Ligand binder design. Structure first.
Ligand SMILES: CC(C)N(c1ccc(Oc2ccccc2C(F)(F)F)cc1C(=O)O)C(=O)[C@H]1CC[C@H](C)CC1
Ligand SMILES: [Mg+2]
Length: 559
């Protein structure tokens, strides 16, 4: 069937939309080519609509059905718990879209009478009505990028705040534990960046002669069929569930997940969806399971040897035993025709790779550098273009989520995150006296509140002390960063080194946690190195909850 059907009504914004980077005194210090940075808006919604609108073709075979059964057998060991209204409300982010039923996110978190009672009524309705298509709002997503040698806006589809809390009640526990139980070491969200690197590096070095590839599915959400969503539910149903959880899942599947009506910001009937909605709680889990199912069966059809895959939502990376240049190419091509028949056609054409560093998955790649003792250490990195573009936008405007804070956490070991992101933001925070002020960021889609001052501990626990001593990066990594800096008009190392030394001196004079930031975060900027020993508060953090599952679009907040 058609992924989408349009009534002709337009995808409208619910307020003025900013497209250009403001000429701000602070952003310009970070990036000078401001005309190269832009924010996607509803003005390009039509372009995206055309790309994501098409009739899906799907042909299922014995491999598909075989993998499906293997997955179900594992789901059969799970027991989900069903969250209480209160627990569910607590998972709602403070900046979550307000309900249209007389209350907002703050009211939800405060367990206000009007939020709870309405939420209760939406839940009773899921138990009683198993058919009526639940209403969804479709909006053009606002995302920042750097122009290329422009991306149309992404389309987000999400139901009312009331339905969102209900999703959590019924499926939060399911989407947090089932993926790992069914996919094992292949589920990527259970890994922190260092651990994802470990898994990739080990899988790679474990092969006699490794061959790997990333697989980009052209517009994955739209390739998701009604069959995929019901199959997905068949997996969730293998869990021991509370009677009401079971019914809620059944109802949500038929009324929300398989598809439903689309309404714009003006309340006008916009169209109908028969594919994956990006803004629901099961998106990440549903995409991971579906992508894992199709790719696993495709590998079997393609005769790829000793396949090892890692999956994160629609993102897929596979590593296997090479059978020779020619054979590998053919087998990969076969894998693709197999994924195509499963309604998962390729966007970027897949290509075999024999150099781990060149393999890009989850927009990142493994690279290597050396610690103070000259020891080789592998870490995760990525092209810094988008991160810096977004850092500049966030420097000019206030935003609910601060991608720069998340990028510093996830990419702490990198040359670019350390030299620029850390130097730039600590300079601003210290100048505005806001080092104590906790800010929100996202990790695997979930929103977290983090105090800039705890970064030292955090970084040590997640990456190890070597994160503060890496040097001698790969020429490939160095060429990519330098290339990025010239393009965006970012000041050279010498300038950052000077700003970093000043930032550090001030941080040290404040003592306490600030001084701790100055010592560890910016030791690279001084010649007279300091001895970096384990930080006491480090081995006392509870970061385990950070890497359990993906939640992008799931409207999740972790206190
Ligand atoms: C070796 C020395 C002195 N060095 C580097 C300085 C620049 C660099 O990258 C470049 C080299 C030449 C031109 C442009 C660049 C780039 F634009 F990429 F930075 C790479 C390295 C490194 O450790 O490999 C360092 O000590 C860095 C260690 C990490 C901090 C945070 C910045 C300084
Ligand atoms: Mg894709």
């Amino acid at each position: 069937s058609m992924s989408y059907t349009w009534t002709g009504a337009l995808i409208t914004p619910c307020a003025a939309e900013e497209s250009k980077l403001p000429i701000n005194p602070l952003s310009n210090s970070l990036l000078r080519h401001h005309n190269m940075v832009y924010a996607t808006t509803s003005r390009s919604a039509s372009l995206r609509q055309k790309k994501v609108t098409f009739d899906r073709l799907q042909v299922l075979d014995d491999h598909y059905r075989d993998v499906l059964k293997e997955m179900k057998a594992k789901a059969s060991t799970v027991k989900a718990k069903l969250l209480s209204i209160e627990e569910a409300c607590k998972l709602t982010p403070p900046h979550s879209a307000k309900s249209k039923f007389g209350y907002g996110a703050k009211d939800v978190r405060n367990l206000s009478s009007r939020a709870v009672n309405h939420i209760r009524s939406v839940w009773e309705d899921l138990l009683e009505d198993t058919e009526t298509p639940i209403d969804t709002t479709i909006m053009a997503k606002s995302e920042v990028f750097c122009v290329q040698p422009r991306k149309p806006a992404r389309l987000i589809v999400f139901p009312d705040l009331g339905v969102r809390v209900c999703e959590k009640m019924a499926l939060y526990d399911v989407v947090s534990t089932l993926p790992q139980a069914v996919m094992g070491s292949s589920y990527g969200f259970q890994y922190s960046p260092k651990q994802r690197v470990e898994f990739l590096v080990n899988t790679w070095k474990s092969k006699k002669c490794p061959m790997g590839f990333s697989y980009d599915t052209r517009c994955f959400d739209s390739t998701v069929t009604e069959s995929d969503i019901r199959v997905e539910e068949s997996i969730y149903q293998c869990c021991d569930l509370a009677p009401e959880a079971r019914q809620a899942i059944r109802s949500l599947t038929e009324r929300l997940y398989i598809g439903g009506p689309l309404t714009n910001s003006k309340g006008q009937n916009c169209g109908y969806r028969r594919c994956r909605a990006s803004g629901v709680l099961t998106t990440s889990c549903g995409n991971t399971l579906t992508c894992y199912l199709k790719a696993t069966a495709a590998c079997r059809a393609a005769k790829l040897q000793d396949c090892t895959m890692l999956v994160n939502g629609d993102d897929l990376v596979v590593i296997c035993e090479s059978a020779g240049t020619q054979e590998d190419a053919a087998a990969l091509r076969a894998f693709t025709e197999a994924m195509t028949r499963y309604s998962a056609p390729p966007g970027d054409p897949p290509q075999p790779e024999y150099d781990l560093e060149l393999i890009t998955s989850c927009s990142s790649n493994v690279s290597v550098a050396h610690d103070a003792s000259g020891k080789r250490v592998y870490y995760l990195t990525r092209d810094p273009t988008t991160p810096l573009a977004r850092a500049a936008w966030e420097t000019a405007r206030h935003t609910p989520i601060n991608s720069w804070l998340g990028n510093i956490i996830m990419y702490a070991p990198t040359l670019w995150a350390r030299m620029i992101l850390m130097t730039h933001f600590f300079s601003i925070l210290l100048a505005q006296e806001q080092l104590e002020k906790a800010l929100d960021c996202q990790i695997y889609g979930a929103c977290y509140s983090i105090e800039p001052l705890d970064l030292p501990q955090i970084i040590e626990r997640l990456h190890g002390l070597s994160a503060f001593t890496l040097h001698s990066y790969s020429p490939g990594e160095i060429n990519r960063v330098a290339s990025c800096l010239r393009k965006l008009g970012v000041p050279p190392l010498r300038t950052w080194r000077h700003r970093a030394r000043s930032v550090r001196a001030k941080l040290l004079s404040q003592g306490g946690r600030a001084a701790t930031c100055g010592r560890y975060l910016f030791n690279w900027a001084v010649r007279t190195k300091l001895k970096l020993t384990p930080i006491p508060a480090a081995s006392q953090l509870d970061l385990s909850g950070w890497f359990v599952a993906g939640y992008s679009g799931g409207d999740i907040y972790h206190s």
